[PDB]
Every structure is written in structure tokens, then in C-alpha cells.
């Protein structure tokens, strides 16, 4: 058997991955199979908490796998018990398609380059037959196409042209879209537009220094350096994947799909170790485009479920992506042959200055009486690339007990061709000659499994409201009275709520079994999040059906094991019809979510109307949300941090 | 004779100019007993400044604006001094207004209340012996507005607290009554006494210095290992007097008693084409309205900028502590009541900081070996001001993508009032400590933008994300996914009076309708991206809504006129909110054109604060931010000529074999 990990939540080691794939190959001996997913099946919540806190049973070390078999539709999935090297659960799912791996993305170009029908379309588009090596494609999942459903595993090849291998191809989209059978390695159809548009004759819009020297004359001189050093080391302590920093303790996990997973998060409140979250991660995304023209409706990538924030994660360059003293973690997956693959330096962990934590000075002695304390933050980060997109993901822990998720969007706009006389509006922007960058949203589903000060939690919407009593009434004489209206969610239906600017809505996750001895309110973490776009796609649309979670800013459902992925376990080519994922978890909306084990799914993100500033490479666009302790502590938890400067009134006086 | 002329017409008054101004005013009013409230630069007219800077035009006169009080006379006198001729050139008496309260004014009240027989009596009734008045403190806010006195006397309300020891933080021990003090007569004229009396708390003070924390929690945390920031080869920015040049931005850094930092004449050098962006940007007013309806708490709605001043209240920033790294500091200079210049050392800090990634892209085809990454630097111009209990840390941030951000961090101490043993603080406040009620309040700010986007003649618009009006299944929207941005250009002032809307992810554009982006066909713009836009919770016709007409909308756009700086009026304390002044005057009947002209864009933003015990006895920083981003201003990402931190092309990746 493979060696047991230091911790039940540790990801599978390369040894465990190989042990799992050998087990599966043996079980299916004599069959031609390939591996899609080999990943930790995390212990049940109850099982984990019982093990960690109650001296309970050691949970079994299990691997979940997804395989394909040549000549069979869909996938097979199951579980391997690593201790006994045995398959313990198995099922065939003939009507689903699974996540696309890096191997799957890389395979499509040589398929389309050698297909006679695609070659013909390139020639019609102005690219000679002997120049197919200049044709590239981003081979997205087809997403959903009602012509084929899930009956074949399909990609759509979004085609581009490079005049030179070092070009950025996105200035030169082609007009047609080949449909490729991933497993058969053949083009089965090409979507050809009614109005043909030949390849742009313009120079490529490039962005490397050699290109910029040509374009603008010279690079800026190297700026003088800003150096960051920690000569005495760091304040955080890692024991395997377990982090301890500024009273926080948590497990840093990682998988193919969600990327970073933070588990078993607690805060040591002066010797009282208080749980906050069992698990927090990003669980799905959708990036719906806003051009109604065919076939652009198929642009609505669910990046997490269709490609994977782990599979697509960047090896972080030392030390350019992350500045300062860094602790890195590697990621391990399976390739199609069942061999372990490694992404080196997939996660970076470091602490950074974060400005002021708090300050107060007394005007009475001209601010000579003063205390200032500087803040440090702990950052656990990754960057993943989904074809043209880069998503920089930063989980940030703060010394006031708050936890923040920061995202920076960069990379390149997805572009489609634009005729010389064609208007890009209202659905996109002409960002370069013959380049149409379509409108799109980026939406994310944050999954929180809370344990605020222990088990038995509830959630609520908090709305700022003026007093209902009118100006001039005894109750509100000067009309200034206002309060926070808390609406505790009793059943799932109550929780389906959106952000509201009219009330500056926040949401609480709280423990109704406990009371703050000062304020009389339950301990809570409050979700403060204002980048909460509505889902622009209509009710009943392909986008709304495939991403049921995205229609509301907040969805709260009962906890059950294996309620991770709110658009379903196998996302590509699902029509959005059926009771699975968030639609299944919501059910008829009647289940209790008050004082129980709950899951809080939050939809946040941005709506992107491209502009030329975004091209040929986009400056980082920020997205953030925060979870803040409110009524959790009885006072500012950071006051025992040594001030950077402190002078009392008496000290100020005796300094004469 | 005359003071030396400044390096630049927007430079604040020097100490010599302040003294020249006050000498001039003292001479003009010789034989009269006068005191100085304000002596500040009167900035050149916009037209005059731009003509001087860009058109070889006349040098604008160097002018000082003053506000004075005269003993035995109501209200104030105000006017202008021509510094070159040392003469008063404009003057008027305003008998029915009251002016901004200075640090001197805040410090004077404690001596008054400690020695007043009626106040001493109330302290004794509250459980503090008559011989312990040295332990009684107050934050002497402006009265704000009280309909019993209007502007007929200059008044403060003394919010009273008790310290058991001078080093205590007093805010755990508010008293129940509120003395009303005549600022100029130095006497208590009234005391607001509540119907139910509450004696001083017997609890220990809630303290926060290390010596206190050692007693409370046992020990301080060990000193953490240092994070050191060095720039061994110096900084990339260049200052010429108060003019900053950094990453193609150029602008003038100004400062005054009221707004604090004022950024002017902001342009961007687009490969040799120096393009104007903003003529002037600053915070122009605030209001911090409290949400308890009980008397006299309606008088808690400080307009901190207009009533105390982000300049007057600014902190001298302690070296290596408030600001980390290699810093350029500026000093602030004001007048005291005697007409003598006073200095706040290190009032503004200027520095550059790493700001993470600017952009990155890698190619999946060679496992991300083809990759470019460029790190971001930001330029930060910052101050921290203290209004009694409040600390506002203000950071003006310039970025290498051409965006400009305002970041605010709120810290300091909750304003607190007394709470009985059996008294419920809700729904209007929170019990954050025994016998301590911290009332609900909002903090609202009015950002004033005088734009010149790619030159003169600007307009403003609301931008709203909308689904296509065509239904799912229609030929126009077959799969129901279509969406667009609906731009509503403001034609008249009335059109501009708009709020943030989450339902449409509303942003606003300031743009130049006279120009066109050659790629997108859209006008060059800067877009306001701002979502911390609370509604004003106080009712229409309330004291708060009347005194802060600007706060009722997220956006107010009005025609430019000279001296349209302060949207709650020039003299804010004790104004009832009745009258056509400030933003109410500028809006008028709402009919004036604001399309393709000189406009002023006032933006209301901020937070609603429901206190919690985490905020006490000292509050962790709470962030507020907004950004102005170029959209259709450039024809491509303006930062691409910055040297990457790492770059490897596809060909280079293959050559690594
Ligand atoms: Cu985007
Ligand atoms: Cu506040
Ligand atoms: Xe892709
Ligand atoms: Xe390059
Ligand atoms: Xe994608
Ligand atoms: Xe978070
Ligand atoms: Xe004050
Ligand atoms: Xe101390
Ligand atoms: Xe104040
Ligand atoms: Xe700004």
C-alpha cells in the first residue's frame, strides 16, 4: 500500500496517484482505458471532524477516478481504497462528458491542421494550404450544442492565425468554427457564417519587448528596484500543509478542479481555539458572452468545471510572480496514461506588509499622544490560464481576523473577426482593426462550509433601513433614525437573495447557539461583497440553465457529503436540464437551513465591456470580497500586536 | 516689501505669505479686535490658470482668502488680499454664518467646562466628585445645528467623558449630559440633561496601549520578524517643487486647511502627446450622520471637512511608521488665531510601492513556457486626519495602466454614549462594552472632480448593463444571452442626479464628445467604478438631508463656475440647511446644460457602520475605495513598454530544447 499522508486532507501524492491508476487498470484489465481525473475523495465532514476533534475513526484514504474507454460513450467513475489497493465503488455514466485536461487542449491543433475540410476553409479565408502550421486554435469544450448533446465528446476550435510563432494570435481570428470529436480525433462539422470574412491583413498586435521596440521606438528604462527582504525569516509556520499564522490555523489543500482548498480554519482566541470554516474554495465559474449571433452562444465557459483551476494552474516563476520570501507547494495529477504529472510551484505562500492595522492620536496635545500598529497579511495564491484568460487568485488572511479573496483578471480578450465595414456594437468592441471583442461577464461561485464558533449555523441578509416612522414623529423627530434589518433564512427558498445597493446588503453566517457577552448578538462572520452582477442571460437561457447558482448572489442549502460542484459533477455538454448540482440541492426550497449544517454559495464577479486599453494584453482588473468577524470577538483581536509607534499622554508630557 | 512669488500658481501659501496676508488684514481693520479663522490660497480661476499654463497667458494674481472674527460682532468677515500689493481687494461681513473650527478651537473647551459651576454640578450628580474635574474630558464638536440658537452664537457641544487616569482611552466612560458652549464668549450657555439619568460607569476603562494589554491579556505578542523595504538606487518619481512626474503622469500636489490634499493639472504623457485628464480632484465635503433618533443625538452628523478641515486636523506623519519605505514629505502651513503661521510637519507622504502584477499571459501549448509577466508599481500621495475620535487615512493612488484610485481606511475610536445597566442599545446602537452604546452612523464623502478628459468640453453619462430587450427564442436573441451597455448621456443637471444601482452594475463615464477613439469609435473617457455608494438613510427634509444636499445622490453633475468648491456651502457649522447655497444653488432648477461644456462631477460614496465589539476600544482599519479608469482613452494597454519581470517567447522556449 502507498504510505499514508501526514493529514487526511492532504492531496494524493504521486505514489498514491500511481497506486490508484494501477488499481483501476487492473480492475478493467483487457479494456482500453484512459484517465481523466484521479483525485482525493475527501473524507465525509462528520468523519473528518470526528477524527480531528473527537478521537474518532481514521477516515479511509480514497481516490476518486474518472476514466474513458475506447468505443464506449461517456465515462466511468468510481473510488479506490488505497490501503487495500481495491476498487470499492464504480459506475458507468454513458450520457455525460468530463473536464478537459491540458493534454486534451493540446491535441486539437494537429487534428484541425490535417483535416481536408478545415484546410479548405483556411484557403477560402486567405491562408494557403501549405501554411497550415500558421493556423492555431483554442479548443474550448463545445459547451453545449443541441445538435449533439453529450452523444460525442466535443470541442469547438476557435481558430486564429499567426504570421510568426511569437505573434499573439488574437488580432487575427478566422471566421469559422470546426467541431472536433475529442476521442475520435476527427473534425465532424464546421460552423461557417453566412457572411464570409477573410483573415486580417493588418500587422499582429504584439506585446513582447522586441515587438514594442518596433511599435513605440523603445522600452522604458528599467525602473530602480524596490527590494523586499525578511532577514530574520517569516512569522508563519507550516507543518506539512497545515499553516499557523497570527492565531489562524488551517489546512492548505489543492485539487485539479477548484485549485486551492482551505480547510479546518480556526482562530486561537487567547488559548481558546475557535472554529470558523470547515472548507472554503471556488467551486464553479461561468463566463457568459453577450453576442446573440450563431455560434457565439456556445461561449460561456464554466472554467472550473470544464478545464479546472488546478489542471490549468501556472508554475509560478521564481521570483517574478511572487515577490519576497515564499513557500511553494507543487500540484500532482494523473495524465491520460495514468502516470503522475507535477506542476512545480503551483501555490505560493507568503506574508506581506498591508499598511496600517489601526491608529489613534489625541488632538489635545497636537497628536503627540498616539498609537500606530502596522498590518501584515498572509497570502496563499495561484494563477491559472484558461486559453486566453488569466485568473490570479489570492486568499488573504488578516490580523483583524478577516479573510479576503482577491482576484485579478488579466491575459487576453477572446476575439472574433470583424469586417472592414462591420459595426461591433452593441455586443462587442472594435479593439483593433478587424477585431471584435465580445461583451461577457466573469462569474464565480464561492463555496463556504461554515463552522462559526462550532457546529449549528444559520445565515441571514442584513439590510440598512431608515426607521419606518416619519420625520416629525415622536419616534423619529429629526428623521435620522436607521437600523440594520436582519432576515434570518429559515428554509432554502428564503436564502435565494441578491446584492442590493438600495440597502447596502451584507450577509451573516452565524451561530445562533451562542451569544456575544457584550453586544448580545450571535458570533458571526459577515460577507461584505459588492461586486455581485446580476446574471444578464434570460431565465430559461442555456447560460441560466447550466449555471443555476449564478441567478442569485446567495444560495444556502443543507450540507450533504459530495455537494461540491453546483453545475454538476460532469459539466461539459450538459444542457442544463435536470435535477443536479445546485438545482438538486435547492429542491423545492422547503428544507430547513436554520441552526444546522449548511453550505453557503456566493455568486460574485464582473461584467466586462472591452475597450482598447484591454488589448493586445489586458491590465489586471480587480475583484474582491471579504468575510469579517462581527460579534465574534469581544474586542479588537489585534491589540496585543506590538505597535510600530506608541506614546501615551504621560510620556508625551514628560518628554517636555 | 511683498512676499516672494511661489514656484507655481497652485502652490499653497508659504509661512511668509500667510504672515503678509494677516498683517495686511490687521492693518485694514486697525483699531478693531480681530482673530483669524482661515488664511488660505484663493486659487486662480480655471480659465486664468489654463491660459497661463497652456496659452502663454497672464500670470494670475497671487491671492489670499481670509475669514476673521471680531469681538462683539456676530458671524464673520471674509475677503481677499492681493499679496503683491499687500492690500485688501474684496471684503464682506457675513453676520449670520459660523466658520470652520480650528485645532485651537477644539482645545479651548475643556478649560471652560471644567470651571463652569453648572457643569461641575452635573458631574457630581453623575458620580464624579467636584474636586476631580481634571478627570473630565470632552470632544467639543460643533453644535452642528440646533434650532434653539441657529447661527446667532458660535456654539460647540461638549461630548463629555471621564478618565480614571490621563493615559486612559476615555470612550468607555461617556457621561449622560451635553454642555453647550459659546466658543467666542468662553462660557457654558446651556446643558442638555436627559430625562433618565445614568451615572458614570464603574467598570475598568477599555484600554489599548501595551502596558494595558499586558494587564488584560497577560503579555504582548513577540515582535514579529521584520519585512524590510528598500530602494537602494532611489525612486522613479521626480518632484519639481510640488509638481510630480511618475510613469507618464504629471500633476501638481496641493494642500489646504479644508480639503487636505488637492491634485491639480493632471495629465498623461502618451508617447510624447501630453494629454490632460483632470483639472482638479479632491474630497470637498463629508457627512457622518448618526442613526439614533433620541435627543440630542440628532446633532451628531459631522461634516468633517467643512466643520473641522482635513488640513487643520491632519497628523504629522511619524517617520518610518505611518509610511514605510523611501518617502518624500510635504509640510502644511496655516494661520493661528493671532495671525501667526503654524506648521504641521510631514503632513503629506509621497512614495512608490509594489502593487503585485500589472499583466500576465502564458501559452498552454508549451505548458506555459511561453510567458510574459510584468509587475506593477503604484504611486501613493497620502495623509491621515483625526476628527476627535475618528481617523481617516486617505491615499491617492496612481497606477501604471493609467487609472487613478482613492483608497480610504477608517480607524480610530467609536463615538460612544452611556448605556444603563438594563438599557437595550438596539436598534440604534450596539453595546460594545459594559455601559457603552456605540450608535449607528454612516460615513459619506463628496469627491469633487473637475475633468478635462483629453482637453476641454466634457460630458458625463451613466452606464448600465442590460439584457437585450428581445426575448429568449426570438431571431434577435435565440439563446437569451445577448447583453449590452446602455449609456445615458446627461444633457441637463437634472439628468445627472443618479444613484449607484446594483441591478445594472452602474458605472459613470466622464468623456470628451469632441474626440473619437480610432479603434473603437467611442469618445475617450475615464470611467468611475465605485460600488461603496450607500443611500442616504436620513429622510427627505431631515436636518441631515438639508445640510448635505449632495449626499442624496451618488452623482451630481453641474456647470463649472469659479468658487464652486464646497457643496454644503462656504461656512458650514450651524447652517440649518435652508437656503439656496452650495450644491442646492449649483443644481438650481436642474435645467442648465452639462453636455459638452466645463462641468463639475461630485460623487457621494462611503459606508454604513453598525458597530460591533471588534471595533472597540480601537477599531481595525475599514477600507473604502473607488477608481477612475481610462476606457477608450488609449488605443492599447499603455503599460506595454514597461520592462517585463519575465519574458520568454515561443521561439526562445524551443531554443531551450
Ligand atoms: Cu473579461
Ligand atoms: Cu464608523
Ligand atoms: Xe481552451
Ligand atoms: Xe522580446
Ligand atoms: Xe476557455
Ligand atoms: Xe474568503
Ligand atoms: Xe471635535
Ligand atoms: Xe505602553
Ligand atoms: Xe467630529
Ligand atoms: Xe480618484
From Swiss-Prot, chain B:
Enzymatic reactions: a primary methyl amine + O2 + H2O = an aldehyde + H2O2 + NH4(+)
GO molecular function, one term: quinone binding
Residues reported in the UniProt entry to bind Mn(2+): 450, 598-599
Subunit (UniProt): Homodimer.
Keyword Signal: no
Phenotype when changing residue 304 to E: Strongly reduced activity
Family: Belongs to the copper/topaquinone oxidase family.
Induction: By methylamine.
Protein name: Peroxisomal primary amine oxidase
Post-translational modification: Topaquinone (TPQ) is generated by copper-dependent autoxidation of a specific tyrosyl residue.
Residues bound to substrate: 302-313, 387-392
GO CC list: peroxisome
Residue numbers annotated as active site: 304 (proton acceptor), 390 (schiff-base intermediate with substrate)
Domain of life: Eukaryota
PANTHER family in UniProt: COPPER AMINE OXIDASE, COPPER AMINE OXIDASE 1-RELATED
Cofactor dependency: Cu cation; Zn(2+); L-topaquinone; Mn(2+)
Glycosylation sites: 228
Listed EC numbers: 1.4.3.21
Chief location category: other
List of residues binding Cu cation: 441, 443, 609
InterPro entries documented for this protein: Cu_Am_Ox_Cu-bd, Cu_Am_ox_TPQ-bd, Cu_amine_oxidase, Cu_amine_oxidase_C, Cu_amine_oxidase_C_sf, Cu_amine_oxidase_N-reg, Cu_amine_oxidase_N2, Cu_amine_oxidase_N3
Places the protein is found: Peroxisome
Native source species: Pichia angusta (Yeast)
Positions of disulphide bridges: 323-349
Metal-binding found in the keyword field: yes
GO BP of this protein: amine metabolic process
Modified residues (2',4',5'-topaquinone): 390
